[PDB]
């Protein structure tokens, strides 16, 4: 019974006809799938690991210099040599300094000076390549079945159970068939390669701390760097980045090695994502995974059960989840055995016609023990109602109010869909996907518009997006012709919303 009270939750309703639905398993969110006569299963992407890592480059942020030496040549001579310019472990700089009889030779003006310092690195940061293969997705699926509120704790404890199944999708094995004993099996046709676009993402490491950085960012940061293949005593390429040569007014030249640069690159790591390592593998989060859910072998477990005929008792007060949905936990005083829990809700208790909906879709007591408890979940209608559990006269009830009006629920659905379109781009059209030509046409149009948008506004931050968006609204509202005005207004609104949605 995971996915309950996660505040980033989705409800996909498998349409009648067709046994498959498309979902986008976002890392951090979750989704519960409920078909017309199938048990409700909530599915969450828990871990994303990268198994094989190839060192691509190793920058330096804690350089040091030890052996300082200088050579000078008088004016109208050649150039100073110092014999250390033949050593690649040293960084050197040639400059012109004032020379004269006081300095100790014949002519006056613009001698040649060279300073060399032995470069060493004390702390280096390593980037690693990530291939779209050899990364493994883990997926936790829990069935709205027997278990009570009491097994949601330690949700990261991916323990397989009678109601909990763990699948492990890889680009080599993207089609696992998840078997949940009793409820049948769930089919997953996942797309591991089209996730976070790990091709353009290295795995930065610096001081036992890891990030997931873009390729261009890692290749465009100026520091002394050596190739990943460089093993042993590294040969540092751009030593001049961490070493500054300054000349006394016109007399000498001094070398200094700059600071630790760790905070500088932390500030440079702005839009990056933190990541962990399990010892050799890049365990991470914040990705997403597109899967196709095959509900063929899913079906309700205890349909042939008889209704529970004994006194149910509430053990916890029904609690509203963050999406207008009420959680109910009850205790059974009967010892008859595995039985159907009779639960519904009605606006009026005289003609107790069922109203609203039920998420669990088959509440069942599965224990023959005297006092056993189970957990439910309902989708009440907007307004007042009653959560009635039990058959006879010894039933129990709980007055319930739901404040989510239909228009308000539609607005929340719209903002949730817009947020997922902002986060996922065109992949958001694959979340409610069950097929359809309107869906495909809209996804294609969004694909081409998003490609144009990425080309025109790709590298831009929150503040820059806001600035250009405001300028575009102005270039909209105040414009001669309406077509260009419409385009400018649309682009400005899209940029402002893209900043706001992550901001809000």
């Amino acid at each position, epitope marked *: 019974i995971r996915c309950i009270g996660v505040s980033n939750r989705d409800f996909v309703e498998g349409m009648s006809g067709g046994t498959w639905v498309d979902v986008v398993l976002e890392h951090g969110g979750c989704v519960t799938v409920m078909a017309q006569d199938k048990p409700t299963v909530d599915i969450e992407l828990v871990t994303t690991t990268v198994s094989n890592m190839a060192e691509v480059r190793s920058y330096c942020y804690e350089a040091s210099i030890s052996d300082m030496a200088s050579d000078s040549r008088c004016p109208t001579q050649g150039e100073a040599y110092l014999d250390k310019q033949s050593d690649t472990q040293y960084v050197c700089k040639r400059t012109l300094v004032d020379r004269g009889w006081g300095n100790g030779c014949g002519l006056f003006g613009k001698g040649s000076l060279v300073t060399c310092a032995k470069f060493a690195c004390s702390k280096k940061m390593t980037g690693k390549s990530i291939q779209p293969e050899n990364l493994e997705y883990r997926i936790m699926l829990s069935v709205h079945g027997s278990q009570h509120s009491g097994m949601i704790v330690n949700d990261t404890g991916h323990e*397989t159970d009678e109601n909990r199944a763990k699948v492990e999708i890889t680009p080599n094995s993207p089609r696992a068939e*998840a*078997t949940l004993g009793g409820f049948g099996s769930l089919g997953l046709d996942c797309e591991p390669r089209t996730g976070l676009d790990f091709s353009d993402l290295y795995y930065l490491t610096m001081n036992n701390k890891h990030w997931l950085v873009h390729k261009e960012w890692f290749h465009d940061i100026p520091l002394p760097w050596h190739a990943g293949a460089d093993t042993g005593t590294p040969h540092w390429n751009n030593k001049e980045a961490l070493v500054e040569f300054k000349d006394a007014h016109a007399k000498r030249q001094t070398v200094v090695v700059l600071g630790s640069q760790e905070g500088a690159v932390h500030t440079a790591l702005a839009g990056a994502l933190e990541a962990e390592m399990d010892g050799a593998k890049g365990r991470l989060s914040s990705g997403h995974l597109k899967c196709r859910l095959k509900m063929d072998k899913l079906r309700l477990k205890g349909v042939s059960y008889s209704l529970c005929t004994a006194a149910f008792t509430f053990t916890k007060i029904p609690a509203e989840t963050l999406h207008g949905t009420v959680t109910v936990e009850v205790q059974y005083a009967g010892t008859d055995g595995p039985c159907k829990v009779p639960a519904q809700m009605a606006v009026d208790m005289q003609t107790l016609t069922p109203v609203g909906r039920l998420i669990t879709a088959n509440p069942v007591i599965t224990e023959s023990t005297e006092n056993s408890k189970m957990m439910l979940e309902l989708d009440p209608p907007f307004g007042d109602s009653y959560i009635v559990i039990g058959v006879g006269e010894k039933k129990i009830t709980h007055h319930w109010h739901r404040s989510g009006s239909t228009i308000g629920k539609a607005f929340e659905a719209t903002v949730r869909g817009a947020k997922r379109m902002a986060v996922l781009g065109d992949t958001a059209w694959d979340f409610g996907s069950v097929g359809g030509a309107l869906n495909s046409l809209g996804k294609g149009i969004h694909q081409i518009f998003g490609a144009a948008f990425k080309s025109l506004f790709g590298g831009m931050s929150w503040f820059s997006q806001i600035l250009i968006g405001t300028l575009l609204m102005w270039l909209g509202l105040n414009t001669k012709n309406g077509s260009i005005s419409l385009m400018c207004l649309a682009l400005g609104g899209v940029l402002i919303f893209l900043s706001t949605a992550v901001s809000a």
Partner: antibody, heavy 121, light 110 residues
Framework: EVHLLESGGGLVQPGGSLRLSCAAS????????MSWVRQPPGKGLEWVSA????????YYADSVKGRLTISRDNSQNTLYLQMSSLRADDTAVYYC?????????????????WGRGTTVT | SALTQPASVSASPGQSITISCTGT?????????LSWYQQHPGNAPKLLIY???NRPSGVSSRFSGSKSGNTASLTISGLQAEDEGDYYC???????????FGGGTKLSVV
């Protein structure tokens, strides 16, 4: 190779208790859901209890439920069974069997490797 | 919802003996989670067939399982003398007692 060794079996007066123990080797004991099966002398097998890969879920048959508790300890790679309120009906040999009950992908509620068994009276 | 098995069967070597297992709707008709076990006296049981038809590595092809309705049967072709021993069927039950076993058939080779 894959060996399961039991211990603790023996003679116990009716109405008492007893502490079984099954040892595991070879396979990764933490990734396998282990089950408990008994057979009274001259009679058929009956599955008694099963535990999850981590001990977070326990299952029992509706003849020993409330009378036995199955526990595992992953660090020492061993699994136990807790007798309680014993009686003559519990006189059997207890087989420690490795199960594929809930692992990943597809399973079929079968048992691969079984222990030698221990005698209980 | 216990499984019922024939008490005993007898067959001569070189023939085929069909052992059968039948149960209620709680364990058989809906589930392929059906496993067959054989047990020599004073020995641990051994799995021959899992998932109705599939067979573990290291098990002879003579054992072939099948299911049809309330009853599922296991067939042993080319019977030998060492095939003597008890045979059990286990299934997954939607009730208490998650796994239920058959009554146990004493196979005899004549």
């Amino acid at each position: 190779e894959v060996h399961l060794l039991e211990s603790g079996g023996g003679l116990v007066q009716p109405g008492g208790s007893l502490r079984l123990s099954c040892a595991a080797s070879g396979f990764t004991f933490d990734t396998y859901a282990m089950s408990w099966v008994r057979q009274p002398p001259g009679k058929g097998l009956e599955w008694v209890s099963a535990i999850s890969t981590g001990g977070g879920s326990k299952y029992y048959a509706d003849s020993v439920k409330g009378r036995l508790t199955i526990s595992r300890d992953n660090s020492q790679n061993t699994l136990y069974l807790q007798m309680s309120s014993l009686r003559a009906d519990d006189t059997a040999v207890y087989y420690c069997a490795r199960s594929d009950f809930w692992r990943s992908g597809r399973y079929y509620y079968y048992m691969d490797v079984w222990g030698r068994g221990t005698t209980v009276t | 919802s216990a499984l019922t098995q024939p008490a005993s069967v007898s067959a001569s070597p070189g023939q085929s003996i069909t052992i059968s297992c039948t149960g209620t709707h709680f364990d058989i008709v809906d589930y392929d989670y059906l496993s067959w076990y054989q047990q020599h006296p004073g020995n641990a049981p051994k799995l021959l067939i899992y998932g109705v038809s599939n067979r573990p590595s290291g098990v002879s092809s003579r054992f072939s399982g099948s299911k049809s309705g309330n009853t599922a049967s296991l067939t042993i072709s080319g019977l030998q003398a060492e095939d003597e021993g008890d045979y059990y069927c286990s299934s997954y039950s939607i009730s208490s007692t998650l796994l239920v076993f058959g009554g146990g058939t004493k196979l005899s080779v004549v």
